[PDB]
Every structure is written in structure tokens, then in C-alpha cells.
Design a protein around this ligand. Sequence first.
Ligand SMILES: OC[C@H]1O[C@@H](O[C@H]2[C@H](O)[C@@H](O)[C@H](O)O[C@@H]2CO)[C@H](O)[C@@H](O)[C@H]1O
Length: 441
Amino acid sequence: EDIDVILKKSTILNLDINNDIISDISGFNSSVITYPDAQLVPGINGKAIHLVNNESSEVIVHKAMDIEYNDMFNNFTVSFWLRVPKVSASHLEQYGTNEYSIISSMKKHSLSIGSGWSVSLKGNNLIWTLKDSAGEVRQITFRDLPDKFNAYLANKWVFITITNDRLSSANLYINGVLMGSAEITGLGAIREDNNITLKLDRCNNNNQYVSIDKFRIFCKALNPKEIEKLYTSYLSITFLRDFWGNPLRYDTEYYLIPVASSSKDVQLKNITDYMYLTNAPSYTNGKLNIYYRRLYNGLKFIIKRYTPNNEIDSFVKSGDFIKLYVSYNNNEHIVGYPKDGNAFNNLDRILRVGYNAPGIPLYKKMEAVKLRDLKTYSVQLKLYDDKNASLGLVGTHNGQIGNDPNRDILIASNWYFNHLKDKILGCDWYFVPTDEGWTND
Ligand SMILES: OC[C@H]1O[C@@H](O[C@H]2[C@H](O)[C@@H](O)[C@H](O)O[C@@H]2CO)[C@H](O)[C@@H](O)[C@H]1O
């Protein structure tokens, strides 16, 4: 009756990565065989599986005796975190009709039937297929969003869950939201392979890769409440995340984008002066129906540790004290607020980059925190003065400095602390590192 108990009780396969080894921690003891080129990369809470396009890049799960035919006639749910690189326009043209499996229970080397289930990709479509012993087929074809900044198969970690209720439908959820469904009555016995294979199969693109984490099978069709809890159970609040959902790191260049105005990049007026938002350039392709604000323009920021601690972790944790720098012309400039510096009426402190007036204290101690919006990969930054008093969360204020044009200028303000329950808030930032999974067309 308790969701956590149900989730635990109904789990019959649960891949975890501990001590750089992948194994089933469900309790069923299914044997996991990791081939030489199955790689391990940063995940949602630890490390994740990374598959490249060669036959040595595979993880095979040998179903234990107890779970052999659990999905022959009974309800089941498959869940996993997934990360797929953004498909280039060129690759959509070349490979858009090429459907390839990434996860499957379908045999194929002894019986040409291929009964069982599969997770496959085709261009920007995510597909779930169930095939019974007579070859009857049912599929859910999810067409991803055209806006790649907000799409699910566009280089961010996203949580997949597909429930199969044999008396009604199969439902596909992404980040706890229902994205597609198919009636599945009319299917008989699903007689699948003894192995569950994580591998790119029939992918014509040599450079394709995918990342998968927390692969889990449940012996029931989970309801929305159970799925929502399952999804949010993976969002460990201690460790901060970059835009892609990977751990935020010290000493790495990040482009900042305000969650509240995601079409905007950050720009610097001049060294020693303020920062403001600018409209990002855009990419649109009417033929392919893809578009997105372009990434990687604007200021490059770097997070540095404020002090040592007791051990040097490369990831940033909520609560960590940091120093924020902008990397400009290969020179690094600290971000902060000068004592008595220009501020808007309400005490919104105007941030300055590389400020160096002799004798004037520059407040630059910040704290990297996660105070709201658990499901989004964003962070807040809290600025302090020299006596550890809060100067506020970093955000923007609309106005003018001197005779400059009206701008959304970066500030620190304690106003945000009274509005943390709001749906959208101007103190939320995405930290975007350049990544091979996202190249602007
Ligand atoms: O402080 C930054 C924050 O201000 C909000 O505006 C507040 C303002 O700070 C306060 O002085 C005034 O009394 O109420 C305003 C609420 O409308 C902005 O809405 C927000 O986007 C930030 O700019």
C-alpha cells in the first residue's frame, strides 16, 4: 500500500553500477555480462552505461529462472534513464529512416520470429514494440518535440518508463509525463529470448552512441503515482547538475542560460562592469521540422572552490561555497559586488566582472544551491558579503545603467527567497558545457 514498498516489491531486475561493475541488485540475481566496449560515463546518480556502435559494446542480462516468462502474459513495466545525442540535420537526412534497437528481449539468431519487446530509435522517434508468438505486433511511436532545447532525445538525461497492462494498453512516459500509448489487447503469449540485450542493433551510423542508466523491470503496470515517485526517487538533491543532467563540476567552462528566459544568453558590458541578457541566435529547419536556440554563445563561466575542504571532489554539491569567474580573452575575472556599488532601489546589487578599484571591498563569496524545481537541471547562486550576510540570489533586474539601452542586468537580490514556490523564477540558471552530443547545425 506504500508506493516505495510496491516499487521495491515488484522489481524483478535492477541494474546498478558499483565499484565499476554492473550487476542486478533486484534480489533475483540475474547474471549480467559486460562486453569489452560497454563504457561507463557520468550518470544521474553515479555512473551510467555508454554504448557505442560496434559488436563489443553490449551488456547482456541472463534472466534468472524465476523471471523467465514474466512478460509472456502478465503485466510489466520497464524503466531506465536515457541520454541520446541531438541528431544533426545531416544525420536526420541520411539516417532518419533507420530504426535501430538499443534494448531488447527479442531473440534473432535461432528463430526468425523475434518475439518479445524492444526499445528502438528512428531519427527523432522513440519506439516501444511488443510482438507475440504469432508475430502480432503493437507499437508506441513517440515523435520528439521539434524544439530541441526542450526535446527528450536531444542530449539530456531523461527518464523513460513504459507500462504494459495486458487487459488494456501499453503507456510510454518520459519524466513521469504520458507521451504516447497503444491498446495491446489482442496480443497473445510473448515468447522472448532468455537474454535482455543492451546494444545498438541495426544502426547504420558508425558514430551513434546512447547512454542508459538504472535499467529496471517491474512485474506490474505502474500507475502514474508510482511512476512519479519512481522518477523523483532518482533526483538526489545533494549533487548539482549541468544542463545535460550530468554532475556540475568545478574548473570547467559553462555557458549560463536563465531558465526563466531560455532564449537569452549572458553578455558582458566591459571588464569591471556589468552583465546583461542578449537574444541567442537561432537555427530553424522547416523541411525537417527542427529548430532550437543555438548553444555556446555568450560568456563562459568557471566555478572555483572557495576553500579546500577535507577532500577534493570534482563535482559541486549544494551548499558548497564557490567563487564564480568569467573567462574572457583567456583571462579569468571574478564576479562579485563592490561594497556600496551601484544597485537598484530595492537593493538588487549589480554584479561586476573583474572589478578592481583600489581599496574597495569586492564581495565574491557565493554558495551553489538547489532550493527549487527538483526536476529541472538548474542551480541557484547565493552571494554573501564579507560578514556572511546574504546579498541575495543571482538573477536579473530590468532597467538602465547610465545612458545604456534598457537591459535585463545581472544582480543579486534577496527578493527571490520569498518566491521559491513559483513555477518559473528568475534566479534559476542552467550551466551548459560544450558537449559532443550537441553541435549547432
Ligand atoms: O529583485 C529582483 C526581482 O524583482 C522582481 O520584482 C519585484 C521587485 O524586486 C520589488 O522591489 C517590487 O516591490 O516587486 C517586484 C515584483 O513585481 C521581479 O519580478 C523579478 O523578475 C526580479 O527582477
